[PDB]
Amino acid sequence: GSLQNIFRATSDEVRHLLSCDRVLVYRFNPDWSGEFIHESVAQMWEPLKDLQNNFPLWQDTYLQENEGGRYRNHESLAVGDVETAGFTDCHLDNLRRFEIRAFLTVPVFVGEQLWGLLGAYQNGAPRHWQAREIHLLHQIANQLGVAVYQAQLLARFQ
Amino acid sequence: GSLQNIFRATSDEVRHLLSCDRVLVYRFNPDWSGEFIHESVAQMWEPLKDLQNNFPLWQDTYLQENEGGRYRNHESLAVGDVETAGFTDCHLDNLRRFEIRAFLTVPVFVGEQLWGLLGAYQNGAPRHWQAREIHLLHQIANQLGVAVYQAQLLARFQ
Ligand SMILES: *[C@H](C)[C@H]1/C(=C/c2[nH]c(/C=C3N=C(/C=C4\NC(=O)C(CC)=C4C)C(C)=C\3CCC(=O)O)c(CCC(=O)O)c2C)NC(=O)[C@@H]1C
Ligand SMILES: *[C@H](C)[C@H]1/C(=C/c2[nH]c(/C=C3N=C(/C=C4\NC(=O)C(CC)=C4C)C(C)=C\3CCC(=O)O)c(CCC(=O)O)c2C)NC(=O)[C@@H]1C
Numbered sequence A, B: 001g002s003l004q005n006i007f008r009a010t011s012d013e014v015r016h017l018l019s020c021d022r023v024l025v026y027r028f029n030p031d032w033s034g035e036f037i038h039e040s041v042a043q044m045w046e047p048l049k050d051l052q053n054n055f056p057l058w059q060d061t062y063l064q065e066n067e068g069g070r071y072r073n074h075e076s077l078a079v080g081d082v083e084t085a086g087f088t089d090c091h092l093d094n095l096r097r098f099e100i101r102a103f104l105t106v107p108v109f110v111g112e113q114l115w116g117l118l119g120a121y122q123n124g125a126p127r128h129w130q131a132r133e134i135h136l137l138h139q140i141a142n143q144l145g146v147a148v149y150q151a152q153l154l155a156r157f158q
Helices: A002-018 A061-065 A069-073 A089-097 A131-156 B002-018 B061-065 B069-073 B089-097 B131-156
Strands: A022-028 A034-041 A077-079 A102-110 A113-122 B022-028 B034-041 B077-079 B102-110 B113-122
Touching (some): A002 A034, A002 A113, A002 A131, A061 A069, A069 A102, A102 A131, A113 A131, B002 B022, B002 B034, B002 B113, B002 B131, B061 B069, B069 B102, B069 B113
Antiparallel strands (some): A022 A034, A022 A113, A077 A102, A102 A113, B022 B034, B022 B113, B077 B102, B102 B113
16 A cells, blocks of 8 residues: 555656656565566556556566576666567567567665566667666665565564 | 764664663674664763764674674574673673673664664663563664665765
């Protein structure tokens, strides 16, 4: 509740600051599968969130098998054109399915834990992500993670 | 500056809530030695902080050699009477030097790192620390660590 407010604020802020088309918050499950729990999207695009406020599944075997992959090391991935990135077909198929032409995805650490991912997406054209934008989203995600942990500390004690 | 305000608020809050005699904030150095950086103490006791706002050294070889010891695992140590605890003499000597008769010392995690320790001390009598008090100080330290990390995130970016 207070949490969805945090996710809304952050996601809308990213979309506003980066002028991207979609922003997603993705939370890892214990087995390193994950779940979308928030979307900010411009009105011209089909939303991933349906009318029951449910999201599609992105079953990324690679993140799961590598228990978060590069994100374990506080690293991000910026891809300017998914079509030229040399991705595995099952991965590219999901990128296309979610109308992702370019993405910038950074880790969200909550306390000491890799809690999830924060993604910024361009839907209708490639995008050369600037080093500054990467640095900015990295910090927005750090701030999100601290907000989540702060909320947990208050909610779960007294 | 804003940091010393955080340390003051936390330390004074602990001393107030626990009705203990002294509270100390101890920050680890890279080599797992450490430094006192704040004290809250009742007026009837000699302070550890001198007129130059410098603190004495507590050179604890055990914390250093064990890179933080039990505190690496989010554990605390509560000792009701240092005189009956079976401590090594070099350790007991420092406890006596700092007028510590009973202590409750918990870890302070800043993001993913064991940043320091938060200690509550009784100076003039033994004290049986209640499980609740241990649980409370543990959370006050969690909150302190989040405040420190939040301050760092804001101070060091833009
Ligand atoms: C094959 C059956 C499935 C598959 C394989 C796959 N994935 C990757 C690499 C990554 N997948 C992601 C997933 C996401 N990006 C986002 O923006 C979001 C929402 C926030 C998700 C869930 C990411 C970030 C990576 C990079 C991971 C890294 O550590 O670098 C690979 C490796 C790269 C490649 O394509 O060869 C593979 C093989 N993903 C699927 O969806 C298939 C069902
Ligand atoms: C011997 C030359 C020196 C020595 C040895 C020593 N220390 C310990 C165990 C601990 N020492 C501390 C230190 C602190 N308690 C506080 O409240 C503060 C300020 C915040 C400090 C710096 C702590 C917390 C422990 C417990 C550590 C743990 O992981 O359990 C030992 C082991 C216990 C024993 O006495 O045998 C030893 C041998 N400490 C000194 O000061 C000597 C100079």
